[PDB]
Amino acid sequence: DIITVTLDETTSATKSANADLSKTNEAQMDPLQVGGEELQIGGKYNFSYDLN
């Protein structure tokens, strides 16, 4: 038996995925000055730091 087929096909598929991570640090301190002079810890260490 003869049967006619209408070819009408349309398929479409998409997918996506993304990720992000970020972190930052910034800590800075000038040498501490008390009494007109620069404070010293130990023998050669200041009250200062720098992180980045």
Added chain:
Amino acid sequence: DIITVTLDETTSATKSANADLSKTNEAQMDPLQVGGEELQIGGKYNFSYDLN
């Protein structure tokens, strides 16, 4: 038995998170002058400081 499936799928998912921290200090004092002369504590220390 023949069953027709209509492919209609749509999924979407998002997520986000962020954080902040901040701190600052700024203390400054000029050398104290009383009586026309610069006050001295101990033998060599002023009344001044500088923090940052």
